């Protein structure tokens, strides 16, 4: 009955055998024909459309429920076949094992808790990042960390799972396995134990406080960077929960010291990767605005990615109107930076200062008090702005200002260069129409 179902590879007959579950249950585990049946169920595991089926999730979960002893051969089979399937197939398998945990109960579920998940995360701690399967392991573990909020009590069983194995993973001397431990830890926070009292609540949150303090006081730069991004996610998610003394101490620690870490530039770029998603914090805007002018020198870095991310927060701040950017940073320092900038950075600066440079709603008087300014006080930044403006905006906006100007005089070279840039603008806007 099942044999022709696997030979035809049809899900309808497998759903029929799902409906007769007790008839499948009557076959003994000791049977070798049941072992061949189990191999054909592994052939069902190979099938991708069965994985897409939610009834597929149902019968695979009850195959896990059927035989406790078969689960270790299932563990060996999925150990053998992680390499073949893709990322969406990995998160599909993760959904299967989430529902497999959910349907399971009793001593079989306790054996699954002592069997499957802890070995997978132990491997994902100890697998090299060179292995592509390692990526699959921590992405399905991140899916589990995302699903722990959906169902209540998941946090407690992962706490009782991670009571042995999180703590020595925190102090793992090897940088890679501690980096993976930090990667799981920063999404693991907060960890809750339901039966414990308020003393133990305050003690465990203070334990997490000193744990993240030591993890951000790591000597390795990449472990520091992962800790930075993690406490950025923590301060974004639950800033209302922490005491304000702890919050002020941690922000002073990550601002007064961390911005000037001359050992590595990309750790400061990781701080830069952090800074937009803390700016959603509405109450702490004066508190962060106290430390906003501390970063004026960071314009003068020699790292490209640092400055690219830096202007990305400048655009983010001008989007959210958190603070006056001209009060934050001098304009002339920005202008000599443009004189020393690169192409995509100058594109982002043109998008940044386009409100300051060219107004579209304001009349020709405002257009000319900015035109005379941008002609006279700097010149090369004006020609870069000419180069990027028609890329950014429509050529009608170019032509209207050209006709305004048509309706520095001491230099013949200046008027010749202005004629040349007018010809350049004409050549740029001719191709549009």
């Amino acid at each position: 009955l099942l044999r022709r179902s696997l030979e035809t590879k049809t899900g309808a007959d497998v759903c029929r055998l799902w409906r007769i579950h007790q008839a499948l249950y009557c076959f003994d585990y000791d049977l070798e024909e049941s072992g061949e049946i189990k191999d054909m169920l592994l052939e069902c595991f190979i099938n991708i459309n069965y994985i897409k089926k939610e009834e597929g999730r149902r019968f695979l979960s009850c195959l896990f429920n059927w035989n406790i002893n078969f689960i270790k051969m299932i563990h060996g089979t999925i150990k053998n076949q992680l390499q073949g399937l893709q990322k969406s197939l990995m998160v599909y398998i993760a959904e299967i094992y989430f529902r497999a945990w959910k349907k399971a109960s009793g001593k079989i579920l306790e054996a699954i808790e002592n069997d499957c998940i802890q070995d997978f995360m132990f491997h994902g701690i100890h697998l090299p990042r060179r292995s592509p399967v390692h990526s699959k392991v921590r992405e399905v573990l991140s899916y589990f960390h995302h699903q722990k909020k959906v169902r209540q009590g998941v946090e407690e069983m992962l706490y009782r799972l991670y009571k042995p194995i999180l703590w020595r993973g925190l102090k793992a001397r090897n940088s890679e396995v501690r980096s993976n431990a930090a990667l799981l830890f920063v999404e693991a926070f907060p960890i809750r134990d339901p039966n414990l009292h308020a003393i133990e609540m305050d003690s465990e949150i203070q334990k997490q406080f000193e744990e993240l303090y030591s993890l951000l006081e790591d000597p390795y730069p990449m472990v520091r960077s992962t800790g930075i991004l993690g406490v950025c996610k923590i301060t974004s998610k639950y800033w209302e929960m922490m005491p304000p003394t702890i919050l002020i101490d941690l922000l002073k620690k990550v601002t007064g010291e961390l911005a000037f870490d001359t050992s590595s530039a990309d750790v400061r770029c990781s701080v830069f990767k952090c800074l937009p998603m803390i700016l959603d914090n509405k109450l702490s805007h004066p508190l962060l605005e106290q430390l906003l002018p501390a970063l004026r020198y960071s314009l003068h870095d020699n790292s490209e990615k640092v400055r690219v991310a830096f202007v990305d927060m400048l655009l983010k701040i001008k989007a959210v109107r958190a603070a006056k950017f001209w009060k934050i940073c001098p304009m002339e320092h920005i202008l000599v930076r443009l004189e020393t900038d690169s192409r995509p950075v100058s594109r982002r600066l043109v998008s940044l200062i386009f409100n300051s440079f060219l107004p579209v709603n304001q009349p020709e008087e405002v257009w000319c008090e900015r035109c005379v300014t941008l002609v006279q006080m700097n010149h090369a930044a004006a020609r870069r702005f000419y180069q990027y403006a028609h890329e950014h905006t429509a050529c009608t906006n170019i032509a209207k200002l050209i006709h305004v100007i048509r309706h520095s005089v001491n230099d013949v070279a200046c008027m010749a260069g202005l004629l040349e840039i007018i010809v350049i603008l004409w050549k740029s806007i001719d191709r549009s129409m």
């Binding site: 001008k318 109107r321 603070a323 006056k324 950017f325 001209w326 304009m331 200062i353 409100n355 300051s356 107004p359 405002v366 008090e369 900015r370």
Partner: peptide, 5 residues
């Protein structure tokens, strides 16, 4: 927060 002028 947009235009300096």
């Amino acid at each position: 927060h947009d235009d300096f002028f």
